[PDB]
Design a protein around this ligand. Structure first.
Ligand SMILES: O=C(O)C[C@@H]1CC(=O)N(O)C1=O
Ligand SMILES: [Mn+2]
Length: 228
Protein backbone atom coordinates (compact mmCIF):
# COMPACT_ATOMS: atom_id res chain seq x y z
CA UNK A 1 0.00 0.00 0.00
CA UNK A 2 3.01 2.30 -0.47
CA UNK A 3 3.50 4.23 -3.68
CA UNK A 4 6.64 2.86 -5.41
CA UNK A 5 9.65 5.13 -5.87
CA UNK A 6 11.67 4.80 -9.10
CA UNK A 7 14.89 6.63 -10.00
CA UNK A 8 14.71 8.24 -13.47
CA UNK A 9 12.79 5.41 -15.18
CA UNK A 10 12.96 5.27 -18.97
CA UNK A 11 10.12 6.82 -20.95
CA UNK A 12 9.15 3.31 -22.15
CA UNK A 13 9.17 1.85 -18.63
CA UNK A 14 7.06 4.71 -17.30
CA UNK A 15 4.67 4.41 -20.26
CA UNK A 16 4.23 0.65 -20.12
CA UNK A 17 4.18 0.11 -16.34
CA UNK A 18 2.48 3.29 -15.06
CA UNK A 19 0.93 5.58 -17.67
CA UNK A 20 -0.98 3.04 -19.75
CA UNK A 21 -2.26 0.92 -16.80
CA UNK A 22 -2.94 4.05 -14.72
CA UNK A 23 -0.77 3.17 -11.69
CA UNK A 24 0.73 5.83 -9.38
CA UNK A 25 4.50 6.16 -8.90
CA UNK A 26 6.99 8.59 -7.36
CA UNK A 27 9.79 9.68 -9.71
CA UNK A 28 13.13 10.35 -8.00
CA UNK A 29 16.17 12.03 -9.51
CA UNK A 30 14.11 14.01 -12.01
CA UNK A 31 13.21 17.31 -10.35
CA UNK A 32 15.66 17.11 -7.42
CA UNK A 33 18.11 19.59 -9.01
CA UNK A 34 15.63 22.03 -10.55
CA UNK A 35 16.60 25.57 -9.43
CA UNK A 36 13.37 25.95 -7.42
CA UNK A 37 14.60 23.29 -5.00
CA UNK A 38 17.36 25.54 -3.69
CA UNK A 39 16.13 28.99 -4.65
CA UNK A 40 12.56 29.21 -3.34
CA UNK A 41 13.00 30.58 0.16
CA UNK A 42 10.13 32.56 1.66
CA UNK A 43 12.37 35.59 1.17
CA UNK A 44 12.91 34.76 -2.50
CA UNK A 45 9.18 34.25 -3.04
CA UNK A 46 8.50 37.64 -1.41
CA UNK A 47 11.18 39.34 -3.52
CA UNK A 48 9.96 37.94 -6.84
CA UNK A 49 6.19 37.73 -6.25
CA UNK A 50 5.33 39.70 -3.09
CA UNK A 51 3.45 42.55 -4.76
CA UNK A 52 1.38 40.37 -7.11
CA UNK A 53 -2.27 39.50 -6.47
CA UNK A 54 -3.14 35.85 -5.90
CA UNK A 55 -6.34 33.93 -5.14
CA UNK A 56 -6.43 32.44 -1.65
CA UNK A 57 -8.85 29.83 -0.33
CA UNK A 58 -9.73 30.47 3.33
CA UNK A 59 -11.06 27.54 5.34
CA UNK A 60 -14.88 28.21 3.20
CA UNK A 61 -14.36 31.24 0.93
CA UNK A 62 -12.23 32.55 -1.94
CA UNK A 63 -10.45 35.91 -1.65
CA UNK A 64 -7.66 37.95 -3.24
CA UNK A 65 -4.55 39.48 -1.70
CA UNK A 66 -0.92 40.11 -2.49
CA UNK A 67 1.65 37.37 -1.93
CA UNK A 68 3.18 39.54 0.82
CA UNK A 69 -0.20 39.73 2.56
CA UNK A 70 -0.71 35.99 2.18
CA UNK A 71 2.66 35.24 3.79
CA UNK A 72 2.16 37.76 6.59
CA UNK A 73 -1.38 36.64 7.47
CA UNK A 74 -1.46 32.91 6.75
CA UNK A 75 2.17 31.73 7.01
CA UNK A 76 4.32 33.65 9.46
CA UNK A 77 2.32 35.49 12.16
CA UNK A 78 0.50 32.73 14.11
CA UNK A 79 -2.37 32.57 11.60
CA UNK A 80 -5.97 32.72 12.77
CA UNK A 81 -7.45 30.65 9.91
CA UNK A 82 -6.13 28.30 7.25
CA UNK A 83 -5.33 30.00 3.96
CA UNK A 84 -4.10 28.24 0.83
CA UNK A 85 -2.72 29.77 -2.38
CA UNK A 86 -4.18 26.84 -4.29
CA UNK A 87 -4.50 25.87 -7.95
CA UNK A 88 -3.07 29.08 -9.34
CA UNK A 89 -1.15 29.58 -12.62
CA UNK A 90 1.59 31.57 -10.90
CA UNK A 91 4.18 30.82 -13.61
CA UNK A 92 2.09 32.36 -16.36
CA UNK A 93 1.63 35.41 -14.11
CA UNK A 94 5.31 35.62 -13.12
CA UNK A 95 7.41 34.30 -16.02
CA UNK A 96 10.67 34.77 -14.13
CA UNK A 97 9.67 31.91 -11.81
CA UNK A 98 9.12 29.65 -14.86
CA UNK A 99 12.87 29.67 -15.19
CA UNK A 100 13.20 27.62 -11.98
CA UNK A 101 11.13 24.63 -13.17
CA UNK A 102 10.86 22.41 -16.24
CA UNK A 103 8.12 20.38 -17.95
CA UNK A 104 8.86 16.70 -17.16
CA UNK A 105 10.03 14.82 -20.25
CA UNK A 106 7.42 12.13 -19.50
CA UNK A 107 4.66 14.53 -20.55
CA UNK A 108 5.85 13.92 -24.15
CA UNK A 109 4.20 10.51 -23.88
CA UNK A 110 0.76 12.15 -23.82
CA UNK A 111 -1.60 12.89 -26.68
CA UNK A 112 -1.97 16.60 -25.89
CA UNK A 113 0.09 19.62 -26.89
CA UNK A 114 2.76 21.03 -24.60
CA UNK A 115 1.18 24.48 -25.00
CA UNK A 116 -1.92 23.14 -23.24
CA UNK A 117 -0.20 21.75 -20.13
CA UNK A 118 -1.52 23.59 -17.06
CA UNK A 119 1.11 24.44 -14.43
CA UNK A 120 -0.34 25.31 -11.02
CA UNK A 121 1.25 26.46 -7.77
CA UNK A 122 0.06 25.18 -4.37
CA UNK A 123 1.58 27.27 -1.55
CA UNK A 124 0.38 27.15 2.02
CA UNK A 125 1.04 26.48 5.68
CA UNK A 126 1.19 23.22 7.49
CA UNK A 127 -2.32 21.78 7.73
CA UNK A 128 -3.89 22.60 4.38
CA UNK A 129 -6.22 19.78 3.31
CA UNK A 130 -7.49 19.02 -0.18
CA UNK A 131 -10.41 16.60 0.28
CA UNK A 132 -10.66 13.39 -1.72
CA UNK A 133 -11.43 14.08 -5.38
CA UNK A 134 -10.47 13.07 -8.93
CA UNK A 135 -9.32 15.17 -11.89
CA UNK A 136 -9.84 14.74 -15.66
CA UNK A 137 -6.16 14.82 -16.72
CA UNK A 138 -2.90 13.14 -15.79
CA UNK A 139 -0.85 14.97 -13.14
CA UNK A 140 2.77 15.26 -12.12
CA UNK A 141 2.84 16.81 -8.63
CA UNK A 142 6.33 18.15 -7.83
CA UNK A 143 7.12 18.83 -4.17
CA UNK A 144 9.47 21.81 -3.64
CA UNK A 145 9.15 22.86 0.03
CA UNK A 146 7.87 20.77 2.93
CA UNK A 147 6.12 17.40 2.91
CA UNK A 148 2.60 16.21 2.08
CA UNK A 149 0.67 13.14 3.20
CA UNK A 150 -1.19 11.78 0.19
CA UNK A 151 -3.83 9.04 -0.03
CA UNK A 152 -4.78 7.54 -3.42
CA UNK A 153 -7.82 5.43 -4.32
CA UNK A 154 -8.25 3.78 -7.71
CA UNK A 155 -11.19 4.79 -9.94
CA UNK A 156 -12.26 1.15 -9.52
CA UNK A 157 -13.12 2.02 -5.89
CA UNK A 158 -15.42 4.96 -6.66
CA UNK A 159 -18.51 3.20 -5.27
CA UNK A 160 -16.92 3.02 -1.83
CA UNK A 161 -16.06 6.74 -1.89
CA UNK A 162 -19.63 8.07 -2.12
CA UNK A 163 -19.25 10.86 -4.67
CA UNK A 164 -21.51 13.86 -4.25
CA UNK A 165 -24.61 13.62 -6.44
CA UNK A 166 -24.48 17.16 -7.83
CA UNK A 167 -22.91 17.34 -11.28
CA UNK A 168 -20.78 20.17 -9.90
CA UNK A 169 -19.37 18.00 -7.11
CA UNK A 170 -19.57 14.55 -8.72
CA UNK A 171 -15.75 14.42 -8.84
CA UNK A 172 -15.52 14.90 -5.06
CA UNK A 173 -16.06 12.37 -2.27
CA UNK A 174 -18.46 12.94 0.58
CA UNK A 175 -16.04 11.21 2.98
CA UNK A 176 -13.45 12.84 5.23
CA UNK A 177 -10.56 10.46 4.54
CA UNK A 178 -8.82 10.85 7.90
CA UNK A 179 -11.98 10.77 10.06
CA UNK A 180 -14.60 8.91 8.03
CA UNK A 181 -18.19 8.60 9.19
CA UNK A 182 -18.46 4.82 8.92
CA UNK A 183 -22.08 4.85 10.10
CA UNK A 184 -23.03 6.88 7.01
CA UNK A 185 -20.28 5.60 4.65
CA UNK A 186 -19.59 2.00 5.73
CA UNK A 187 -18.12 0.85 2.41
CA UNK A 188 -15.24 3.32 2.80
CA UNK A 189 -13.49 1.36 5.56
CA UNK A 190 -12.62 -1.66 3.41
CA UNK A 191 -11.64 0.26 0.27
CA UNK A 192 -7.96 -0.37 -0.56
CA UNK A 193 -5.59 2.51 -1.17
CA UNK A 194 -2.00 3.63 -1.61
CA UNK A 195 -0.35 6.34 0.45
CA UNK A 196 2.88 8.24 0.73
CA UNK A 197 4.68 11.17 2.25
CA UNK A 198 5.87 13.27 -0.68
CA UNK A 199 9.10 15.11 0.13
CA UNK A 200 11.07 17.89 -1.60
CA UNK A 201 12.54 16.94 -4.97
CA UNK A 202 10.08 14.07 -5.55
CA UNK A 203 7.39 13.89 -8.25
CA UNK A 204 4.13 12.02 -7.71
CA UNK A 205 2.35 10.73 -10.81
CA UNK A 206 -1.42 10.83 -10.20
CA UNK A 207 -3.08 8.94 -13.09
CA UNK A 208 -6.09 10.50 -14.75
CA UNK A 209 -9.21 10.06 -12.57
CA UNK A 210 -7.29 8.55 -9.63
CA UNK A 211 -8.89 9.80 -6.42
CA UNK A 212 -6.46 11.75 -4.24
CA UNK A 213 -6.46 13.41 -0.80
CA UNK A 214 -3.62 15.66 0.39
CA UNK A 215 -2.60 17.16 3.75
CA UNK A 216 0.44 19.41 4.13
CA UNK A 217 2.67 18.35 7.04
CA UNK A 218 4.87 21.46 6.96
CA UNK A 219 4.95 24.84 5.28
CA UNK A 220 4.62 23.60 1.72
CA UNK A 221 5.07 24.58 -1.92
CA UNK A 222 4.13 22.16 -4.72
CA UNK A 223 4.02 22.62 -8.52
CA UNK A 224 1.57 20.52 -10.53
CA UNK A 225 1.54 19.74 -14.27
CA UNK A 226 -1.87 18.77 -15.66
CA UNK A 227 -1.42 17.02 -19.00
CA UNK A 228 -2.99 14.50 -21.42
O1 LIG B 1 -1.60 19.47 -2.96
C1 LIG B 1 -2.80 19.64 -2.75
O2 LIG B 1 -3.32 20.18 -1.75
C2 LIG B 1 -3.84 19.24 -3.78
C3 LIG B 1 -3.32 18.67 -5.05
C4 LIG B 1 -2.16 19.28 -5.85
C5 LIG B 1 -2.55 18.88 -7.17
O3 LIG B 1 -1.86 18.99 -8.18
N1 LIG B 1 -3.81 18.47 -7.23
O4 LIG B 1 -4.55 18.09 -8.35
C6 LIG B 1 -4.34 18.43 -6.03
O5 LIG B 1 -5.50 18.08 -5.84
MN1 LIG C 1 -6.47 17.38 -7.77
Amino acid sequence: STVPRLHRPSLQHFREQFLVPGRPVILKGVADHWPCMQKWSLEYIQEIAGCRTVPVEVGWSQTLMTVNEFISKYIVNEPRDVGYLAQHQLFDQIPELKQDISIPDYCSLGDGEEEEITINAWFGPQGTISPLHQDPQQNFLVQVMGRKYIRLYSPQESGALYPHDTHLLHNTSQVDVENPDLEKFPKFAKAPFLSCILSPGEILFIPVKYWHYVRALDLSFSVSFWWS
